[PDB]
Amino acid sequence: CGGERYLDFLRFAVFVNGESVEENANVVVRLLIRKPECFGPALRGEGGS
Amino acid sequence: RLQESISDFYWYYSGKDVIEEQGKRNFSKAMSVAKQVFNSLTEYIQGP
Amino acid sequence: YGESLCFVQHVASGLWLTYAAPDPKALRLGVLKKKAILHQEGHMDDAL
């Protein structure tokens, strides 16, 4: 529940007027992969469904 | 840190044939700061 | 004071003072503490 609320904020930061803001999109993706736990128990890599 | 930033800025414009106005202005202020740092380092060691 | 890098060694055993390389899944607990141990090899950053 808490994670979804932060996800939609990043949705508005990277997508403006129907186009993707590449400056923000690249930063968010790199930040997300540096902390893989942001993807939930799934998409965890090892031991993750 | 300033030198590394200037080196990165050069590589950004290395491919481009001509540096545009905004890039030149940012180069000018970086050089102005670099002048002060060099002057400060010079003042530290002179005397000697 | 504040310049010399010192490696702490136990005289009788020859072991080096170092950290315990904390096990994962403990970072979520907020434990930034690293347990100090005496080890035969240690690490390169054991200087104090």
Next chain:
Amino acid sequence: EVQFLRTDDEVVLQCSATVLKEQLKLCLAAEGFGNRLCFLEPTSNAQNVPPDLAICCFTLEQSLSVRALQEMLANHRTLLYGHAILLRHAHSRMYLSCLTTSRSMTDKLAFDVGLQEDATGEACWWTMHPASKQRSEGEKVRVGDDLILVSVSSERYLHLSTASGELQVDASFMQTLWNMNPICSCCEEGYVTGGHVLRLFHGHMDECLTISAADSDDQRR
């Protein structure tokens, strides 16, 4: 004197693992011909079993900043943290790369680490990052430092996986500390060095030390 890693130097990528309370040191190795994938050669038992170090040597060909790498991709230096390095396999003359395939079943987000025939593309470039707060970006990389290697193309760490029963190296999102132990920096003309392949001649270039030919009765021993 503090040793600094420079280009054209031969190094070995070495990591550490825990096996039955024992610290085992492993070197990244690859055959090149017939098998592109990289494996781990143990070296802690070199006293009793010599390791096969002929396929563990890599040459630091280039070391560039991220911007310089981007510029050169569009078209002896000292190693600095944050730079991108190009590792060439000493034997096969191939380049260490982050392969797009994945033979592991435990990690679905991992990629195989292997050798690439050419240095083209960004899949064969790795950025060095400090493992601890002791080193910072832009500082010189020193011998014995722990490094964090991140693939430029895949944004994944050079990871040692212990999920299976064996020890395997792959490109995952979990970091792993590596040591770039130097092998040789600069060799004078002539002046035999270790790790070279040579012949031992007895007299005036007439007889040389050798074993029996193939399919011989003495089992070539």
Next chain:
Amino acid sequence: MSFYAALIDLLGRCAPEMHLIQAGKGEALRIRAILRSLVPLDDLVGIIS
């Protein structure tokens, strides 16, 4: 379900625009490759099905 739907929505909006992919920009291609690795195509079809 809402978390992963929000997560997939965020990653989808971080994808580069078509004109960047057609231009062959290296950064755009790298980002799309990372996104494809995170979310396999078969899982997308399975959820829709």
